[PDB]
Amino acid sequence: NQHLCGSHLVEALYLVCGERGFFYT
Amino acid sequence: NQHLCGSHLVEALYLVCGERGFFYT
Amino acid sequence: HLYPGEVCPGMDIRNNLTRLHELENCSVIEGHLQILLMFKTRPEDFRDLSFPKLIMITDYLLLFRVYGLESLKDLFPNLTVIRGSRLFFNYALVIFEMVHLKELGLYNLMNITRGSVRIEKNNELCYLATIDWSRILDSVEDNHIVLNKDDNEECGDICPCPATVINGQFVERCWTHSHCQKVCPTICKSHGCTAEGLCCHSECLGNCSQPDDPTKCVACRNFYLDGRCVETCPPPYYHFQDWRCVNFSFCQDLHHKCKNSRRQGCHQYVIHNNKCIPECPSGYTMNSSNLLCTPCLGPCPKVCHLLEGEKTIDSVTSAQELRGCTVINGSLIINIRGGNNLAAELEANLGLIEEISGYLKIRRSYALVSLSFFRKLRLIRGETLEIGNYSFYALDNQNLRQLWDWSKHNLTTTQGKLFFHYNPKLCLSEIHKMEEVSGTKGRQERNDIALKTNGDKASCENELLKFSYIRTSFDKILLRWEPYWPPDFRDLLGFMLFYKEAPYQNVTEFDGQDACGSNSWTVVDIDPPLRSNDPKSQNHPGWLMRGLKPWTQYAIFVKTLVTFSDERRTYGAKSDIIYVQTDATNPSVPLDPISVSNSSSQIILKWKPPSDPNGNITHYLVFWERQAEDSELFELDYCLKGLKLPSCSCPKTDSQILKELEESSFRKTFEDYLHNVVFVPRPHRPFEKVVNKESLVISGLRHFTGYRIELQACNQDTPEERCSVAAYVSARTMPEAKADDIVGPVTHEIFENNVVHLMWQEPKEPNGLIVLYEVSYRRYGDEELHLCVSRKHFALERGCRLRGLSPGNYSVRIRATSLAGNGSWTEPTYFYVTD
Amino acid sequence: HLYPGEVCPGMDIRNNLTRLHELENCSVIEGHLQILLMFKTRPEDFRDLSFPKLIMITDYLLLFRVYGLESLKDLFPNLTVIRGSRLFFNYALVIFEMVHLKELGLYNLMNITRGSVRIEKNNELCYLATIDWSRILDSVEDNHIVLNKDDNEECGDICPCPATVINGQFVERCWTHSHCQKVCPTICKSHGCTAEGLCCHSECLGNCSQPDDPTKCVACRNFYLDGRCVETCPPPYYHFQDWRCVNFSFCQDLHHKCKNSRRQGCHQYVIHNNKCIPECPSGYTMNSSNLLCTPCLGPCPKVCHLLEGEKTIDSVTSAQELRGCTVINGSLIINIRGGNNLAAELEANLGLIEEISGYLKIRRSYALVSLSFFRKLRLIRGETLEIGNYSFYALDNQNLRQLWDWSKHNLTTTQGKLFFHYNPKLCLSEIHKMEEVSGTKGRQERNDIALKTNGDKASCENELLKFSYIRTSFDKILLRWEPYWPPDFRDLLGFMLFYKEAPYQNVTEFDGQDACGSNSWTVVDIDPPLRSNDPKSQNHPGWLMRGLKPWTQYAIFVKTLVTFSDERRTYGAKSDIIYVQTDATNPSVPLDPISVSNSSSQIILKWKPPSDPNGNITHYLVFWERQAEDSELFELDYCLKGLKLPSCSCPKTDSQILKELEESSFRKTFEDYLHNVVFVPRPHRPFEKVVNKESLVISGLRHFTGYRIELQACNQDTPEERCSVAAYVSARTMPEAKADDIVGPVTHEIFENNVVHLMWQEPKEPNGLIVLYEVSYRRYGDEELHLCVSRKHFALERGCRLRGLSPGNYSVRIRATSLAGNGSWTEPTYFYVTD
Amino acid sequence: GIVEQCCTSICSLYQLENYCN
Amino acid sequence: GIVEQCCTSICSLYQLENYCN
């Protein structure tokens, strides 16, 4: 599918970037 | 009223012209 | 003769009666016959004139609002055939708003060829249910007999015609008070018969003079030629008006007398294929001298220059003006209101068109099923367009299902814009497929064609569901099918499981139909399976049905449920229909065990088959047993008082469904705001088994006893013998014979204290149980004094005694009275005691 | 102290735990506090840190997807107040998708000021039904507690807090395993109380140290000033962020430190009305030196330069960015999904707008009721338009009812085109009235605004029906109202008569609601009245109801029914609602007549009131009667065996309704074609009446007899005494006394044949009927030999006898045994006979 | 043609007198 | 802004890696 919507996006974003953290202003 | 439609007009038109008759080609 | 009168043109009748004089010598009438609007007319002057020779009517006969006629039988006695070349709003005979019409009187209607019949709004008619249209007509569906005096059964209907069974009743079919309907024998229907039933020559209809003659009947089928009628006329003559053939000397001056343009009622009649046709069709052009029409050089189409740009098509009379035309130089609107169907005549009437110039608009239709009557559409021009700059317009079509089969069809649209609204049986796939044959691909208006109501009540999906595991029991059934997700899994409402039973596998496709009642499918609703976020998941959904009758055929299928949105995606999925069956089980109890006591060694017993068979039952389980007959009666003195003698819903809660979709998407729009803030991009008993019967007799069995006989019905036996419960009935033989009384030596012993002891023998094989020896002693001149001795009294004494006797000669006699009745008497013995 | 800690600005917590270190030393937090997305976190390192001093949170507290917290009671022990100046999508406290949260642990929540709370998607929580939000919150309607572990009763819920009855149960309200919820006494709600119930100074909330003190509680209501809190601050200071007041030496440098445009998170704070506001509103402009803002010369509109042209309004969070603005330099879209209502906060948030530049579009709303929250719309510019060239766009609004009250409102539209679809509670009169205030009158598109679906499920008519004759009975009711016709009388389907009962005249307006069962109105359908073509007509229609309960209030009204067509005319009519009542009648039978035999002159009897009252009953009809006691018993020898001892539907069939409108209009189009061809233009018992009681005793009446007592209930009496049927009950006294036995001289007469005749006296007033004199004679050494004498034997003999007696001395005694029992014995007399 | 001239809009006595000669 | 870039159309691994620094 790769329509990473709903609770996929909270998991798969961590699955690709689980150590840098996310970005904030 | 004078919305001569439906079964009014079959009686209303004879009442105004019941002696010459109607017209046909 | 066949048609002895004159050929006689069509005519109208209005405002007087003197214009009916010129029907003096007519028999056939080409065209139509309209009698209309006489108000100053007494009922007297209809009883002196008639039209006896009028036989054939081509197109239609119309009666509307005439004051003074009560029946037509004094005017039209011998008319038989309604040919129906041209019609009148799908009908051929219409009676409308009569004031004096008591009875019809049309005892000679034989064959209505093309069209139908309709009578409304007449509060004076009777005998209308005694007509039997299905013997005259060739169709019954487009008839209409509503709103007359016979809406209430009040005006008699007593009438002397085989009293047919065409309906569920034995109704007698008669025209009027003095006529009854003639019906042919059914070996030869349309050939016409005589009074003796010997039907005529095959080219005749209705009445005849003598059968098997093509020269002396009343009206043929195909044509007419000079006292005869042949199927195809020989070519000294050419056909004309599809009921005659005639020489070319006849048609030629009709072209000549009104090639002078003095009336537009002619057409320049041309010879083609032995026909005297008004206009020969496309690909042909007339020659001057020969008066035929030769194959035209190149393509030259017969254009149809439509008056005032648009012509609405209401019925087959509106459609017959376009017959033969192929280039429409205007626009075209089809509008068929109500009724049954017209798609059997539109192919043969305007199925030869190719070029429309304006727009095609389908509004307000109710009973079309397909647009396939348009055989040869390929090009829609659009020099003019409808308002809003449109070219194709479908609106409020309650049953329009398939536009065209695209695999064998073409369609071009030069310019314009299409439009769709309120088409509840029309799929969103077809209109998109309509675009892919069309010249347009993205010419839209915003708002263009609809997306929500077009086919909202008729399903299509291009995703299918397969079942995986089926589990069978006798009462429950467990179901499990494959997992499935839309491309956004938050949009999922669960599943709909429709199910019902069926006796066979001829189950119709579920079109979509609900009720509060029970005449259609029932449905259960299922919570959606939980999300795993794992492509190998537990999410195989399932549901278990509970209240099912065992050994019954079933049919199930499931359906998805998505929120309808603005995107033309996520169409959901439909599982295929399948068939499953419940398992077998124990049978039910058999019914009504009836036994009759007629003989000693014949004890009959019958029963009824059980209510629930639970499959094919195999046999029965009978049992019987003898019994010692209730030994509490053995200690009764049978001389006191008392002796015994043996023998409401909720289909849809749509606001809550609107509430269910609201709060679910409220959860969808909540997290959508959450993500867009928190993330920022980086810049044992004797018995037997009986089979195939409902009654049973048992022989070889003891007289006067009870047999409690119980009976089970049962399915298959040798693996897991499983049967139902029984029901117990007692049974008795016929009442006993002489053996209830005993024969024996009646001996006595005299004691010195005047007590006489009697010795005898008891009954050995009694009437079940002997209860009383009715002994009685009798002196000369004295009545038969009876005495009493019990069962226990004889058992202790082995005899009886009598105390306090006068000296004399006595006559003592014994009766063995059993519980089933009294026996005979013994010998009255003579013993004497002296002084 | 009140707030002894520091101020802290807002902060976010992401991907680690080391950034929570800088919450070391403060108590209040302005802005908000977001803790977000820690995955590599054990549950161990939360058991050593806390934040004990944090008390006040201004806007919102957010927890979403943290791996490792089980409770917050080891982090936030003392926070009490959520101020709610800014919100977060109508909420102020949101817990979303927690993985480890066993229990909340928030034992100090006192007052949620503005907004609501919502916790979803946590499969680990418990004790959630023990919280009692209505004691903390000020609203309960917009809360959302769904889809947790407490969907199933499985998490224990045994907990030691007054156990309130705020619901229908006596549920105990506690936070966690070791805490109870504190509840104030209800004489002083929001002032804060102590453990002894003596509530504090009026300017405090929640916990306090000592009551009635404004200097030593924990958190006040209005503001804060230096260990005190006053309702309005004195003006050495100006207010700031609606929770403090502070000197202008403080507010001046925040204008100075970031008038340097280094961050857009500031606003140039201006003094106005003792407030340190970010921007003072329209009609004002700031001065340079004084730092206030003076009233501007002329009009100065505070414009609101909207980013990217359009900003969708999803909630009060999205709407608070427009607060104070009055000129919208873009377009505007309102979109409120689901929920309860937001029309109480939009007026105080964007109700000060006057000028929109783009377009206003209302899609997908569910819970709006009116657009009156827009207070001051007058001009819609439309420099840009929506696609299709539109300016006003309403679509799919399930409850939008009134657009505006036009009598006190104005609206201009410079250009553009309006649009309406799927507005089921929006009338066609309003959108035409919307046109008559608008600048446009006939700017349409074809297809423009809808005409069929807009308000199809909510009625409006501008024609009314008055009733003429009402007829009242006890069972039926006959109804007759005025005649009425549409402008074309063929378009009429009949009438719809809705009716139901009501206990009072507080009957709601019929909104339109159906059910397949019985919880709402039932409806009957009426054939239309026939045509007379005469203005003085019989055609007053009528219908008679049948199955009505007597003496019941009713409410009826009727409704018209027209075919919906393209013409915006013949809207039909609505009759006004009225009230009628059925008449009274006979009552029903009273229930349960219960009588108890306790005394001889007290016979109690109670009953029950009847089931059907049929109005107010007035009294009762009692009757009683004595009886001769069954004289068949007078001729029994009472010495044999046997002595006696006394004491699913069709709400709508819409396809057939579609069939009914089809074939009716099929009759319309048929005569429509007929007229256009045939017409061518020219070129007694003791009793009483008892009232107000349910039991009755009757005195002065005979011992040991039956009284059949029957009882009726009854309505009004003197004109037309009409009562119900009765029910009969026998009644008896206490068992009899000594009078069942008699005292008398027991005299004897000796005859010469040793037969002794005894003379005595009988009982005079017996136990109803004396049945047996149990006489008994006794010899010395011999037992009490009993003898027998019946009623008829004493009646014929006047005494008794004994036959065959040995010579001696005997002791004879009599017992009077009646049918109600045995009496005593008489004197054993001594008579002697000798040899 | 007498319907749309005398049922859709209002109808005059000079109009329908043409229909009777 | 991560929904309409990664739920309405297809989404790439180079797009969403910007969201993680």
Residue numbers in the entry:
A (entry chain B), B (entry chain D): 3 to 27
C (entry chain F), D (entry chain E): 1 to 160, 169 to 655, 683 to 718, 756 to 907
E (entry chain C), F (entry chain A): 1 to 21
From the study:
The insulin receptor (IR) is a member of the receptor tyrosine kinase (RTK) family and a key regulator of metabolic homeostasis. The extracellular α-chain is composed of a leucine-rich repeat (L1), a cysteine-rich region (CR), L2, fibronectin type III (FnIII-1), FnIII-2α, an insert domain (IDα), and the C-terminus of the α-chain (αCT). The β-chain contains extracellular IDβ, FnIII-2β and FnIII-3, transmembrane (TM) helix, intracellular juxtamembrane (JM), tyrosine kinase (TK), and C-terminal domains. IR autophosphorylation on intracellular tyrosine residues stimulates two major signaling pathways: the AKT pathway initiated from insulin receptor substrate 1 (IRS1) and the mitogen-activated protein kinase (MAPK) pathway initiated from SHC-transforming protein 1 (SHC1).
During the classification of the IRA43+Ins dataset, we observed a population of particles (23% of total particles) with a symmetric T-shaped conformation (4.18 Å). Only two insulin molecules but no aptamer associated with the T-shaped IR. Each insulin bound to site-1 and site-1′, which suggests that the second insulin competes with A43 in binding to IR. At saturated insulin concentration, four insulin molecules independently bind to two primary sites (site-1 and site-1′) and two secondary binding sites (site-2 and site-2′) at the FnIII-1 domain, which leads to a symmetric T-shaped structure.
